[PDB]
Design a protein around this ligand. Structure first.
Ligand code: SAM
Ligand code: TYD
Ligand code: ZN
Length: 418
């Protein structure tokens, strides 16, 4: 079973309001071999709570990281969107903070090592840390040195001893996946020199609330983060938030730079600005999260009836992409193989498998192109621009997409938008 949250990860208080509860839900990245039955499929409570002190949003429970990540088989996206964004991460880190060539960049949750590869092409020394054994072996094979472990205070000390002081420590979409964020902050503090930086990229709570991105709630995602809660945490570990960049990726994200409290790096005014913006948009008030809650109920209900209505008219519907978040979407909406006949997905490992809970089949794009699908529910909506850009033939044939946020809508729209 999953361990229950007592006190807050960031600020250490214990005072939260309930925001939404989806009950027991199977793990979003636990895809299944098809056929037979699925009686023993594990399910865990999926509910979110908001800490009234620092306003970290968090799941009620913490599924064991060993279970989640040790055989995590899914590689970093090889999409043009992510290739470009990884190049941008390098650019921002190097150019904004003046990291010279030959500097050392450590990455937490480095996966297959593609982000590090880009840092190596910019002339940097690198090292990865990722517990997915399979994936770490691929990175190591490719020539990108990766320790096959979770990040910790002791692994941090092993890195310092063997590899030295990093000019940059990077964690992309991994900081929200770690329960003991205090230990990370400690390992980081020990690692950083006077002008070293700790940069983390996470989905921005402001964007999640405003665009009603409830499908981004899943067990892997323990935290849902704003700038406020991070300052609260780093205060308690001799670390200080020095800069933030808002990004379009993954439905609205923040790339947060953190340095030693008593180090070289000055705090930029942007940090205060975003903290003021968070207050100004109701993040410290109960109503905001009750409003989120009904938006979810509204979107969930109108998404299912929209799907079931179209099916009743004799239209065929499939899912486009089989991302982790799509499995929250379809489980919460209670959709099944009768509603979506398959989900197409470019991930070879996923092809031939079946989705968690809903048990919808996952098929290949080459198969999908042989089927007369009228609507695709766009589950990988964070890649909307890239996806729509290569689906001209489908759209030209009168095919349509259903987007789940900010509100359910049909692409193409009825008129040209300027
Ligand atoms: C969703 S992925 C992020 C992959 C990559 N950073 C990206 O942005 O595409 C989460 C990755 O972090 C790894 N991970 C999870 N918990 C970790 C921890 N405590 N320390 C280091 N890596 C971790 C997982 O094995 C997985 O490869
Ligand atoms: C960009 C793109 C992604 N996909 C799929 C590949 C991935 O399995 C999924 C995107 O998942 P992603 O959001 O990158 O991560 P996660 O594995 O946590 O969901 O969508 C397509 O099928 N076609 C596409 O054009
Ligand atoms: Zn808190």
């Amino acid at each position: 079973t999953a361990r229950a949250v007592t006190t807050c990860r960031m600020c250490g208080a214990q005072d939260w309001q309930e925001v939404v509860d989806f009950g027991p839900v199977p793990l979003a990245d636990s895809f299944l071999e098809p056929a037979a039955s699925y009686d023993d499929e594990p399910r865990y409570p999926l509910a979110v709570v908001s800490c009234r002190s620092c306003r970290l949003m968090s799941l009620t429970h913490v599924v064991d990281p060993e279970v989640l990540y040790r055989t995590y088989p899914y590689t970093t996206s090889d999409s043009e969107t992510i290739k470009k964004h990884m190049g941008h991460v390098v650019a921002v880190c190097v150019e904004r903070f003046g990291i010279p060539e030959g500097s050392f960049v450590l990455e937490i949750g480095s996966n297959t090592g593609s982000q590090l590869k880009a840092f190596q092409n910019a002339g940097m020394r690198t090292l990865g840390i990722d517990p997915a054994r399979n994936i770490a072996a691929v990175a190591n094979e490719r020539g990108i040195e990766t320790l096959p472990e979770f990040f910790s205070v002791d692994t941090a000390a092993l890195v310092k001893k063997t590899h030295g002081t990093p000019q940059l420590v990077l964690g992309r979409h991994v900081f929200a996946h770690i329960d003991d964020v205090s230990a990370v902050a400690e390992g980081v503090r020990d690692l950083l020199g006077p002008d070293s930086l700790f940069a983390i990229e996470v989905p921005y709570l402001v964007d999640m609330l405003e665009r009603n991105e409830f499908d981004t709630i899943y067990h892997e995602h323990l935290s849902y983060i704003g700038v406020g809660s991070l300052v609260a945490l780093f205060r308690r570990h001799g670390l200080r938030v020095v800069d933030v960049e808002r990004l379009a990726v993954h439905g609205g994200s923040i790339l947060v730079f953190v340095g030693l409290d008593e180090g070289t790096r000055a705090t930029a005014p942007v940090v205060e600005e975003l903290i003021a913006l968070e207050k100004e948009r109701g993040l410290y008030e109960d109503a905001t999260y009750e409003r989120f809650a009904r938006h979810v109920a509204e979107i969930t209900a109108e998404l299912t009836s929209m799907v079931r209505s179209l099916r009743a008219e004799g239209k065929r519907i499939a899912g486009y992409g089989a991302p982790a978040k799509g499995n929250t979407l379809l489980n919460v909406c209670g959709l099944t193989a009768d509603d979506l006949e398959f989900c197409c997905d470019t991930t070879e490992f996923k092809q031939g498998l079946v989705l968690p809970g809903t048990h919808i089949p996952v098929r290949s794009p080459e198969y999908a192109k042989t089927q007369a699908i009228d609507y695709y529910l766009l589950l990988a909506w964070n890649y909307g621009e890239e996806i729509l850009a290569k689906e001209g033939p489908f759209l030209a044939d009168g095919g349509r997409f259903i987007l789940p946020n900010p509100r359910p809508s049909i692409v193409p729209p009825g008129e040209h938008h300027h």
